Structures are given as C-alpha cells and as structure tokens.
From Swiss-Prot, chain B:
Interacts with the NUP35/NUP53. Interacts with AAAS, anchoring it to the nuclear envelope. It comes from Homo sapiens (Human). Disulfide bonds: none annotated. Belongs to the NDC1 family. This is Nucleoporin NDC1. It is found in: Nucleus, Nuclear pore complex; Nucleus membrane. Depletion of NDC1 from HeLa cells interferes with the assembly of phenylalanine-glycine (FG) repeat Nups into nuclear pore complexes. Component of the nuclear pore complex (NPC), which plays a key role in de novo assembly and insertion of NPC in the nuclear envelope. Required for NPC and nuclear envelope assembly, possibly by forming a link between the nuclear envelope membrane and soluble nucleoporins, thereby anchoring the NPC in the membrane. The gene is NDC1. It comes from the Eukaryota.
Swiss-Prot record, chain C:
Belongs to the Nup35 family. It comes from the Eukaryota. Functions as a component of the nuclear pore complex (NPC). NPC components, collectively referred to as nucleoporins (NUPs), can play the role of both NPC structural components and of docking or interaction partners for transiently associated nuclear transport factors. May play a role in the association of MAD1 with the NPC. This is Nucleoporin NUP35. The modification Phosphoserine is found at residues 7, 12. Interacts with TMEM48/NDC1. Forms a complex with NUP93, NUP155, NUP205 and lamin B; the interaction with NUP93 is direct. The modification Phosphothreonine is found at residues 1, 3, 8, 36. It is found in: Nucleus, Nuclear pore complex; Nucleus membrane. It comes from Homo sapiens (Human). The gene is NUP35.
Swiss-Prot record, chain D:
One of its GO terms (biological process) is fertilization. This is Aladin. It is found in: Nucleus, Nuclear pore complex; Cytoplasm, Cytoskeleton, Spindle pole; Nucleus envelope. It comes from the Eukaryota. WD repeats lie at residues 39-77, 80-119, 131-171, 177-213, 221-277, 283-330, 339-379.
Swiss-Prot record, chain E:
Expressed in all tissues tested, including heart, brain, placenta, lung, liver, skeletal muscle, kidney and pancreas. Signal peptide: none annotated. Transmembrane segments: none annotated. It is linked to Atrial fibrillation, familial, 15: A familial form of atrial fibrillation, a common sustained cardiac rhythm disturbance. Atrial fibrillation is characterized by disorganized atrial electrical activity and ineffective atrial contraction promoting blood stasis in the atria and reduces ventricular filling. It can result in palpitations, syncope, thromboembolic stroke, and congestive heart failure. Essential component of nuclear pore complex. Could be essessential for embryogenesis. Nucleoporins may be involved both in binding and translocating proteins during nucleocytoplasmic transport. It comes from the Eukaryota. Phosphorylated. Phosphorylation and dephosphorylation may be important for the function of NUP155 and may play a role in the reversible disassembly of the nuclear pore complex during mitosis. It is found in: Nucleus, Nuclear pore complex; Nucleus membrane. Interacts with GLE1. Able to form a heterotrimer with GLE1 and NUP42 in vitro. Forms a complex with NUP35, NUP93, NUP205 and lamin B. This is Nuclear pore complex protein Nup155.
C-alpha cells in the first residue's frame, strides 16, 4: 500500500534488474513465506528516493515502524538515517557542520552496531576522511559481540 | 539614422519602465547605489 | 376493488427534470462545430483579392 | 446566454453605485470629415455630447478627456492643476491613446492629423506650450478616427475610413508604414491584443481583417450581414469578442498559441461562436414591464477578465432608443462564459454615452461612465 | 386517461412512472428528487435508460433517456449537479441532483411500428422491440458522414431481400407476435428476445 | 525564501500542536516568527497575506503594527490583542503563535517563549520588543 | 425457499447493481482462477447483502 502511494513504478525502476524480473515471477505466498531480498530492496529503493530527492527519511522510517514489525524494522530505519547523514556529509562544504553530521551519522550506527556492514561503513568513512568514526564504530562493533569478555 | 538617437532615448525609458512594471516594489530589495535606487523610484512613481 | 386513496391536500414539491438552459447548445452537446461568421480560406475569394478586392 | 437571464433594472430613479458580493448596490445619487467621425466615434452621440473621448493612463490614476470645444483636458489624482491642451491643428477630436511604459506621452486623433502631446508629469501646467505637441500626418489619412499603441510601447497605429491602409508609426524615428490591402473599405477602428502579437481592424463594409505584429500578415472575415461595429480581446489575447450592426449578437473567436514553427499566419479558429443574445425582450419590475434589447455599440473588459461591460443602444421600439449598460461576469478558462451580473443605471434622465475600465485598480475593477449630463462617474466592482 | 407504465433504473438511483404522454422520476430509497418531463404531445409506449457511446456526447452527459410513442423515438441527455473533481469525500449516494437537457439529442420516426420495450449494451448500442415481431437498433455517431446520418433506426428481424416479397403473401401468413422482452449478454456479446406467443 | 529554507533545518518534521496551517510546506506562525527574528516585516507580511483566510483580524493588527515607525499597535488595538491573548493564546499548543503575539501586543512579560527563543540574544530580542517608555494607565503592570 | 406478502400489484421488480471484486489475473495464476465467480459463502466479507 505504501509502495503504491509513493508512486510504485518509480521505486521498482530503482531496483537491480535481476530483482525487477524476479518481482514478475515471485507469487504473494512466495513473497510472504520465502523471500527477503525483494521486500528489503523495495524498502531500500523507497528510502533511496527520499535520500536522493532530499526528503527527510525520518518521515518514512517512522511509518515503516508501524507497518513492518516482522523482526522490528527499526534497525533498517536507523541504518537508513545513519546513511542519509553520511551521504549528505559528502555534499556539505561547511567543515564544522560536516563534522557535526558525521558525529550524528556515527551515533545512529553506534545503536545497531551488531548488524552493521562495518567494512562498508568504515570504507565509506575513509571516503570522507572520518577516521574518528572508524575507531569509535569498530570498537562499538566489538563491545556488543562479546559483552561478557 | 537621423532620428534613431531619439529612438534610443525612447527605448531606454521603455526598457527601464518594462522592469519596474514587472518586479514592482520587489525592486526595493535590489542592491544598487542610493542615487540609482532613487532614480528607480522615479520609474516606479511614473515621473519620467 | 377500488384504486389508491388520495393524499392530504398540499402545495406540490415537484420540479422540472429538464432545466431551461438559455444557451442554444445541441450542435455542441455532440462534439462538433456547425454555423456562424467564418474565416475566408477559399481559392476563389483569394483570387478575387488579387483581381478586384471585395 | 441572453437578456432573458438578467435581473431587473433598478426602479426608475435609483442610481447603481458599485458591485459587491456580485450584487449591484444602489442609491438616490452619487459624409464630410465631420459626419464621417460621427459615423464611427466611440461616444454613442459624439456629434452633440459635451464629452467626445475619455482615456485612462495605462498604469496610473491619470486620465485624459476630449470635449466638444476640441479641448483635451488632463486630470490626475495627485494634481488639482488640470492641463488644457489645444493646438492650431486640433479639430473634431475622435480618439485618445496614452503611451504605455511612459509617465508622459498622449496621442490625439484630429480631422487633419495626429497630435502626440508630451507632458511634464511633475510640472503639469494649466496650458502647455504648442511645441510640446509632435504633429504626425500623411495624405489621404484624414480624418483620423482611432489610435492604438502596442503594449511594449514601441509602435502606434492609426485608422481612417477613407484609407485602405492601417498606418503604423514609430513616433521616435518619426516613420510612417502603411499596410495597404487590396480593396474592401478603409479602416474604422483598431485594437491590439495584450500580448502585442495580434490586431483587429474593422471597416465600413461587412468585412474585418485581423493582423499579426511579428511578420505583418493578414486574415480575413467577410461573412457578416452588417459592418463589424465593436469588439474586445481577452487579457491573454486568446479570445476576441465582436458585434455586427443589425445583429443582436455577441460573437466570440479563438486564437491558440504558436506551438509550431515556420509560418506567419494570424491563426484564428475557422468559425466564431455565439455566446450572448440581445433580442427585444421584456423583464418584469416593481414599476411594471421594462423592455430591453437592441445593438451593442461598445464593449469593454476589465484587466482581470472577470467583468464585461456592454453599451447597448435600444431600437426605436424599446426604451425610446436609449443606450443602456449591461454588466456580465466573464470566465476565460477552461470554457468561455458570459454570465449576467446586472444593469447599470445613472442620474434620472441621463443616458450612458461612453464606458471604459480602469487599467490598474487593486480591488476587482473600476468602470468609468460618461453621461449625457456631461458628468463622469466611476463605479467600482469589488472582487 | 388511457395509459400507465412504472419501472426502475438502478444505475442512477431513480424509479420512473408514465401517465399518458408524460414521464416522472424520483429516488426509490426515500421518495426524493421528484422530477418530471413535458416535452411530448403523444402517448408514451416505451421507456429505456442508455449507457452512452464514448466520444460522441460531452462528458456531463453520463446517461441518456430514450422514449418511444406511436410516431417517434426521442433521445434526451441525463446529467448530475455539482460533482466537483476533488478528493477526500466518501461514496455516499447519487444526491448530485439529476437533470435532463431541454434539447432532444436525436428523434427518429416509428414507421407506424408501435414499440414496447427498450434496452442497451455495455457498449451503448440501443435496441428496441416492435409489435411487428421485430428487433430494432439505434445506430448513432458524432458527425454526419456523406452517406451516414448522425443517428438512424435499423431493423434486425426483416431480412435484407424482403422487399422482393409481395406484401399480399405477408398479410396472409403472418399474425403479429409482439416482442415483449429483449435481454442482452454483455459477458459473451449475445442478444436474446421473447415474444407474446413465447417464441 | 531564506526563512523557508532554514525551516527545512529547524523543522525537518511537523510538530503536533502548531495551528492555522501551512504556506508552501511550512507552518504559518514559524514562517512569520523567523521573518520577524531576521527583521523582515515585508517577508513576514508575505506570509500574513498568503494565510489571510486563517489569520483574519491578525492581518489587520499586523498591518497596524507595520504602519507605526516604532513597532506599535495603538493602545486602542494593543489592548484588543491583550484581551484576546489572555483568553485564547497564553495556553495555546503553538508556541510561535504565542511568541508573535507576546511581541506584537507587548504582553506576558512573564513568558520567555523558551520553545522558540534558542539563545540569550533571543531573550534580549523578545524582551527588547516587549519594552515601553510610556505611561498609559491602560497598560496593566504585569504586561508593562 | 421463502415467501412474503406485497401490498398491491408488482408494477416492477429489479435487482440493484452488483459490486464485483476484480480477479487479479497475472502471468502466473491465469490458469488457476475460475472464470465463474465463487458462491456467496466465499465472498460474504467483501460483498454486502
């Protein structure tokens, strides 16, 4: 319903083509019982429209949290907010505000750190010279893998 | 070509009026010299 | 057996179903144009405006 | 639409003061070259009326009035001083036209010339010098009946019923450019569209010609029972209203925009439409019958395009042949509509002699009316 | 004085009644929107609602009313008040007060064939039942083509070569079996008829 | 246009309590307030003209306040606003709708607009617009 | 089977228009959806009396 209302045909055209063709052969009972990549990629495309076309992802993340308690889609929504701030930090030319939005982006990833692609996030920090968040998030991604020592 | 200089004086006054009659009082926000803003007001008030 | 009983006497609430619309529109209620003053497109009148001019 | 949809005229002693809520609120008060001007003048009785022409300045509360003594007077809301204009060539004034994109320039049509008065807008003296009056004329273009400036301020037109050529003037290089057509009549009245791209030209005959201000092309309309008497463009110029002498009809004609290249063609629809009728009707009033209908002598639209004022003249069977002001509410998109508003009435025993709207009134519209008493009224229409 | 016919048109939320020459319509769920039509001078013999063919009439003409008398077949346009193109309103009733056009869109003579029942397809082909055992159709279009009227009546029971049969052989071996009913299958594009004598 | 752009940073989500609606995607009272806080009563007047149909008499009071030199209603309208605010707005769910009234009508010196004034400059600016130099008996001392 | 009494002669008798639920026939289930509609016990949620 949410994908129909956010103009559908747009969000489906943002997908990888291999998923655009899989979408035509997966039945609703396959999408419910068996699939995860089509459902995750449709959420990811909906949010990449918000990030690219520069809406605030908070105003779709909070809607996905009412309608997608599977396992709770709060962590996809936090990762999406952490990513929104990280990709906007690549366009911010105001240094102190880039250092703000990187320490904000970091404090979203520092919640969900057990489930973060730390290699990709820390490489995406190298791509903005944010070596501070590479030390912090990589410790906060060991901190909670072994909380017992 | 003998009278074309009166056409230049006439078309410069129509050209300045053609900008005061689209932007109107938004032209008070336009950064210019104080005597140019004072001249621009004479082309809003229709004194020219 | 008799027919139906009459109402208690009133003043009628009944309206016309056809509205008295004062614009002659039948020839445009179907998607068309038909007749009015018109544009001089013809070759004969254009030849007249080279030869005579009415 | 027709007169058979209008509200009654107000009772035979009330004056219409303004429109508000779409209601008209009332109160108790607020040929030779001479007779060839009288055949085509915008004033319903120009040969006997004290007032020969009225014209607003196209951007400000300044106006010009031509009178039966061939004075032109200038009035302004910020001046108690009234310039009295009279040149040695000024006779039988037929038309007035202020220049757009200027404070300071007025054209006047006379029996033997055009006069372009230059007027010092801060120094409005009671009688300016006869040098402040640039004379324009050409052989055969006499008398001059009508004058029309281009909206962009760089061109002027003039009309003469004797002359099978519209005269375009540049007033600044001082050039004259006849647009000669291959017979039919000469030029009676002239009207630009507001884009400055289209021009209506009427004649003494059952033919009008519309013209293009880009490539100077012509399109021809000869399928009328009488002469085309008057007309008006919509604010976008996409619609042209017109009326014909002997025909009780307001016609409309459309002109779509040039979404396509490579031809100067004026581009009107192949047909007009009929939208409002002015047939010889009755309406019931507290004073008994009134009777209406006749021929539309002048039509003027507001700058907003939401009010059309129509100066009808009755036939000698209807209100003794008096002229009457009808007011329509108008719409220009998506459909074109002529809804009634009502009937505008003046001082008891007056006749309406001329109508025109104000070009820059920041509260709906403002209708100037010139009366047979020699009075001028200004009736606001609030929207 | 002489005739009465009463019926329902569900797809407009209105019932209908005729009295001699005249027709009356109201909403069947309340007794409301009672409205009549007087544009006749001959007895109504049949009534029918029609779903219009697209691209012929203007978009306010959502339905047509069809009437038939001893002499003519009258076609009128039906429209609805003040249904503005907004959103955020629920599906509550056809209370946009119903209106006929005062211009008949078309008229078409009977040939003196009394007509008794009228119907149409979901594609706007109008079918009429004649007393002469005949099915008829109204074939209509927007313009007048060089060899085709804007509107006309057609007969589907009288075979195209029937003008070669002397009528003295018809008036000796035919006996009026009126078509009292037409039924239409828009799900298979089939048409059915039933007569008085149950053919 | 600067203030409408700044609201994409200060109000990146709609706050549940704001009143009288939106202009161009942003709240009417926030668009009035930040135009006033940056001194542009002409930019604030654009909002007050755009939202006239909700603002009602606030447009006529704002236009009285725009036509003194000194950011003043007459005592004959400032005390209309005091007698409106102390009945309808002191306990409102929109704090921009409080702050703009507390300024324009010099009322509730006992409110600091702490949901709208971010800094010590904004306390200074609030109280400095609330200042009088004048001795009307009509000015009740809890507003003076 | 059921009966009811009617006051006067039945001058007319009609149904009112069916709501019908469109069958989402896709490249997959096109051979598996009945052309006929289900009986009312199968549709008595989505369809009113």
């Amino acid at each position: 319903k949410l994908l129909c209302e956010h103009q559908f045909t747009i969000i489906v055209a943002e997908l990888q083509k291999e998923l655009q063709e899989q979408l035509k052969i997966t039945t609703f009972k396959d999408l419910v019982i068996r699939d995860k990549e089509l459902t995750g990629a449709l959420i990811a495309s909906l949010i990449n429209c918000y990030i690219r076309d520069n809406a605030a992802v908070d105003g779709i993340s909070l809607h996905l949290q009412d309608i997608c308690p599977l396992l709770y889609s709060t962590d996809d929504a936090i990762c999406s907010k952490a990513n929104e701030l990280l990709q906007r930090s690549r366009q911010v030319q105001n240094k102190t505000e880039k250092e703000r939005m990187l320490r904000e982006s970091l404090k979203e990833y520092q919640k969900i750190s057990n489930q973060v692609d730390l290699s990709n996030v820390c490489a995406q920090y190298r791509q903005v010279r944010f070596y501070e968040g590479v030390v912090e998030l990589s410790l906060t991604a060991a901190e909670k893998k072994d909380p017992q020592g | 070509y003998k009278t074309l200089r009166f056409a230049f004086r006439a078309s410069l006054k129509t050209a300045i009026y053609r900008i005061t009659t689209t932007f109107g009082e938004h032209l008070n926000a336009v950064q210019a010299s104080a005597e140019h803003q004072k001249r621009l007001q004479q082309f809003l008030e229709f004194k020219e | 057996t008799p027919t139906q009983p009459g109402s208690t006497p009133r003043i009628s609430t009944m309206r016309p179903l056809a509205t008295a619309y004062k614009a002659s529109t039948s020839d445009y209620q179907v998607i068309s144009d038909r007749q009015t003053p018109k544009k001089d497109e013809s070759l004969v009148s254009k030849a007249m405006e080279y030869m005579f001019g009415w | 639409c027709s007169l058979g949809l209008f509200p009654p005229p107000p009772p035979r002693g009330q004056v219409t003061l303004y429109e508000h809520n779409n209601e008209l609120v009332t109160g108790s008060s607020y040929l030779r070259s001479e007779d060839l001007i009288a055949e085509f003048a915008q004033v319903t009785n120009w040969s006997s009326c004290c007032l020969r022409v009225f014209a607003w300045h196209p951007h400000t509360n300044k106006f010009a009035v031509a009178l039966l003594d061939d004075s032109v007077r200038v009035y302004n809301a910020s001046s108690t001083i009234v310039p009295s204009l009279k040149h040695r060539l000024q006779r039988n004034v037929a038309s007035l036209a202020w220049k757009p994109l200027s404070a300071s320039v007025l054209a006047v049509a006379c029996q033997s010339c055009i006069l372009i008065w230059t007027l010092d807008p801060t120094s409005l003296s009671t009688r300016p010098s006869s040098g402040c009056a640039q004379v324009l004329s050409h052989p055969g273009h006499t008398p001059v009946t009508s004058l029309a400036w281009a909206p962009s301020g760089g061109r002027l037109l003039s009309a003469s019923p004797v002359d099978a050529a519209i005269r375009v003037w540049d007033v600044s290089t001082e050039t004259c450019v006849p647009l000669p057509w291959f017979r039919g009549g000469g030029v009676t009245n002239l009207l630009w569209s507001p884009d400055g791209s289209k021009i209506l030209a009427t004649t003494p005959s059952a033919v009008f010609r519309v013209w293009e201000a880009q490539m100077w092309t012509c399109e021809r309309w000869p399928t009328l029972s009488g002469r085309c008497q008057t007309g008006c463009w919509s604010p976008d110029g996409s619609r042209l209203l017109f009326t014909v002498l002997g025909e009780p009809l307001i016609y409309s004609l459309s002109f779509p925009e040039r979404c396509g290249e490579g031809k100067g063609c004026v581009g009107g629809a192949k047909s007009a439409t009929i939208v409002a009728d002015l047939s010889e009707t009755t309406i019931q009033t507290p004073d008994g019958e009134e009777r209406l209908g006749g021929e539309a002598h002048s039509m003027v639209w507001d700058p907003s395009g939401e009010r059309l004022a129509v100066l009808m003249k009755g036939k000698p069977r209807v209100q003794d042949g008096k002229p009457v002001i009808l007011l329509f509410r108008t719409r220009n998109s998506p459909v074109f509509e002529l809804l009634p508003c009502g009937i505008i009435q003046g001082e008891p025993g007056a006749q309406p002699q001329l109508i025109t709207f104000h070009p820059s009134f920041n509260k709906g519209a403002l209708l100037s009316v010139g009366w047979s008493t020699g009075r001028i009224a200004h009736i606001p229409l609030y929207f | 004085q002489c005739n009465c016919m009463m019926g329902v048109f569900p797809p407009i939320s209105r019932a209908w009644l005729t009295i001699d020459s005249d027709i009356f319509m109201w909403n069947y769920e309340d007794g409301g929107d009672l409205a009549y039509f007087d544009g006749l001078s001959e007895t109504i013999l049949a009534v029918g609602l029609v779903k219009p063919k697209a691209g012929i009439f203007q978009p306010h003409v959502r339905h047509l009313l069809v009437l038939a008398t001893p002499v003519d077949i009258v076609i009128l346009g039906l429209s609805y008040a003040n249904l503005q193109t907004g959103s955020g309103v629920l599906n509550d009733s056809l209370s946009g007060g119903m209106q006929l056009l005062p211009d008949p869109l078309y008229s078409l003579p009977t040939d003196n064939t009394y007509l008794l029942t009228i119907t149409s397809t979901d594609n706007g082909r109008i079918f009429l039942a004649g007393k002469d055992g005949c099915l008829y159709e109204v074939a209509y279009q927007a313009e007048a083509g060089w060899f085709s009227q804007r509107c006309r009546k057609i007969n589907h029971s009288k075979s195209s070569l029937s003008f070669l049969v002397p009528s003295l052989l018809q008036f000796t071996f035919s006996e009026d079996d009126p078509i009292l009913q037409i039924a239409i299958d828009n799900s298979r594009n089939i048409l059915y008829t039933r007569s008085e004598k149950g053919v | 246009q600067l203030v409408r752009s700044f609201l994409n940073i200060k109000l990146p989500a709609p706050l549940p309590g704001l009143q009288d609606g939106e202009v161009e995607g942003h709240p009417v009272w926030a668009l009035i307030y930040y135009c006033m806080r940056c001194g542009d009563l002409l930019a604030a007047s654009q909002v007050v003209n755009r939202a006239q149909h909700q603002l009602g008499e606030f447009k006529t009071w704002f236009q009285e306040y725009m036509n003194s030199k000194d950011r003043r209603l007459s005592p004959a309208t400032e005390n209309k606003l005091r007698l409106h605010y102390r009945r309808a707005l002191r306990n409102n769910t929109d704090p921009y709708k409080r702050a703009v009234y507390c300024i324009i009508g010099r009322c509730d010196v006992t409110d600091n607009q702490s949901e709208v004034a971010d800094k010590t400059e904004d306390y200074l600016w609030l109280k400095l617009n609330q200042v009088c130099f004048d001795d009307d008996g009509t000015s009740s001392p809890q507003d003076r | 089977q059921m009966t009811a009494g009617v006051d006067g002669h039945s001058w007319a008798l009609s149904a009112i228009d069916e709501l019908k639920v469109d069958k989402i026939i896709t490249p997959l289930n096109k051979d598996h959806i009945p052309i006929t509609d289900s009986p009312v016990v199968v549709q008595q949620h989505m369809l009113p009396p």
